[PDB]
Amino acid sequence: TLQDIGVSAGINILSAFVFFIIFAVLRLQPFNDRVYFSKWYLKGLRSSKFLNWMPEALKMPEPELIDHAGLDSVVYLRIYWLGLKIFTPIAVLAWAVLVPSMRFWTHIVMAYAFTIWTCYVLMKEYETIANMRLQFVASEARRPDQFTVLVRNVPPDADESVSELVEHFFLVNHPDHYLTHQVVCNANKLADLVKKKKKLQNWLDYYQLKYARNNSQRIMVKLGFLGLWGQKVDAIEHYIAEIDKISKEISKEREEVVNDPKAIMPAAFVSFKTRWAAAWCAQTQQTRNPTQWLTEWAPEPRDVFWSNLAIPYVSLTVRRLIMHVAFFFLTFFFIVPIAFVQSLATFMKSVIQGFLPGIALKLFLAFLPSILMIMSKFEGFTSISSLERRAAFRYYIFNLVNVFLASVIAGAAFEQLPKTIGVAIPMKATFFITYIMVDGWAGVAGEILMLKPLIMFHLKNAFLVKTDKDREEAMDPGSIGFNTGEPRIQLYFLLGLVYAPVTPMLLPFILVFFALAYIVYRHQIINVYNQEYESAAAFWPDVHGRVIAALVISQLLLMGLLGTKHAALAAPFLIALPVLTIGFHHFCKGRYEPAFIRYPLQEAMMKDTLETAREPNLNLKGYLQNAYVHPVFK
């Protein structure tokens, strides 16, 4: 309750302030600059009154920040500014209209204005992001992707190899445009192998340094309880035998994979002389039969998820269905722990009653993004970007169904002791506020520390590093974590929209979270979070659709909420909201999303002509030949 609300808020804010103190203290430490400044290091800019950095983050203006970091990161940062802009006027206007009858039409017009302002700011920022994407891609440098494309589902032929097939096909179809062809290799088991070799070499290095320190004994083979099947106290010879065997294993794998007809799938990489050729051919249904020669734009060379490549195309739909069903069952299963958590939300002892449930919830939700990651790993998308897309989608679905609906249902049920659900709904605001403060303020004030990378790096250096220059690749700070970033704020958007016309005080905490997250993530993206891939901000439409769905769901649940005073005779105003919303969405889509999903062919003319004018004498063929060949054995 209110007292517990204040106590939990205080404990969270003090924890966050202590987190800032720790961040500053370790920040000034001189022997860990390698970590908290991964950037300026992968960019090669550095080598070797107590909160001053706070505004220091805000400089380095937006075009400059784009140059420093990258577009998609800028958009992700922009998300928070979007949200704060959306909810500030809504917050103040509602807060003014807190009359604690006329309230019915009051909330009705309040929600109408809320939605109209929301869609207005949405479309405005949508156009702005469209323009900045256009400018960014226009000013973009050359990458091998923009003149090649992925192709899939080529009909098989017993006599002619796939190379001859594709050569004949594209010479007939697009003469004077074809450049080269690359055949996919189905040796992912060798990739698992080379990962194993890396891990074993890492182990052997550890035991080598340890034995150099002093002679020791080891009997725990990665399990302790199920350790070595004996003593094997020395075990260096064990790894020597292992590396010998695996060396002959990889040598063999080479000598058959260089001659395996089975290593080829009905898919390949083809490159064209001009971007326009790529668009015209691979962007459009290429043949008369739409069931073969299936093509879409190629991923970045470092985006190629080679493991997924070995999935037969016929089986992916079956995989999709099986995975969708398994997803529904997993959401079913994880209802019960959440129900436990909410039931925990039932005198100075009640401080833990208000506090713990959010923490516990977060702990049972810590794993789930990883499960969704693997889940998409079994999915077929072949590009870590698209994996991020789908994973975020799944996380949204799970959070919406469980953390919101299941929680409110459980709260109402445990409160009940048919005409009571309406008065039940708003009361869960306290629970949601607590969950927000916890999984937000504290969580961000912690993840600013990068405890896990920091500890990993320090243990690596003190206990595992053998020479120098190996620190440099040792930093793997990880990307922004889109699968975790986008959906959390998406959920907050949903909650704000739903509870705004019923419960105002949810909003200011949301504003606090938005501000702190904006500034902290800005600092991070300035100094850490090297981006593993750089898409053309292609994810934005998904966010737009998600927020639209959020708004319409908020409207519909509000309509349900006004079922308290039965038949207020204003329902047909709540009926117009969804149709207007969906019409707005469809119009926005058909009017602007081509600028994202399609690549402007006129812009292709401009870019290719400018490239030709600035350099008509580039041997681009050899530059593009060896791309998309192989991760390890190029």
Curated annotation (Swiss-Prot):
Topological domain ranges for the Extracellular compartment: 505, 565-567
Cystine pairs: none
GO molecular function: calcium-activated cation channel activity; identical protein binding; mechanosensitive monoatomic ion channel activity
UniProt subcellular location: Membrane
Cytoplasmic side: 26-78, 124-319, 373-389, 450-482, 522-541
Listed GO biological process terms: monoatomic cation transport
TM segment ranges: 3-25, 79-100, 102-123, 320-346, 347-372, 390-412, 421-449, 483-504, 506-521, 542-564, 568-586
InterPro entries linked: Csc1-like, CSC1/OSCA1-like_7TM, CSC1/OSCA1-like_cyt, Csc1/OSCA1-like_N
Regulation: Activated by hyperosmotic shock after mannitol or NaCl treatment. Activated by mechanical pressure: activated in response to membrane stretch and poke. Membrane lipids play a key role in mechanosensation by acting as a wall mainly formed by lipid head groups.
GO CC, alphabetical: plasma membrane
Keyword Transmembrane tagged: yes
Keyword entries, A-Z: Calcium, Ion channel, Ion transport, Membrane, Transmembrane, Transmembrane helix, Transport
Consequence recorded when altering residue 58 to E: Abolished activation in response to poke without affecting activation in response to stretch
Keyword NAD: no
Membrane topology (UniProt): Multi-pass membrane protein
Family statement drawn from the similarity comment of this UniProt entry: Belongs to the CSC1 (TC 1.A.17) family.
Assembly notes: Homodimer.
Biological role stated in the UniProt entry: Acts as an osmosensitive calcium-permeable cation channel. Specifically conducts cations including Ca(2+), K(+) and Na(+) in vitro. Inactivation or closure of the channel is calcium-dependent. Mechanosensitive ion channel that converts mechanical stimuli into a flow of ions: activated in response to membrane stretch and poke.
Listed name of the protein: Hyperosmolality-gated Ca2+ permeable channel 1.2
Organism from which the protein derives: Arabidopsis thaliana (Mouse-ear cress)
Gene that produces this protein: OSCA1.2
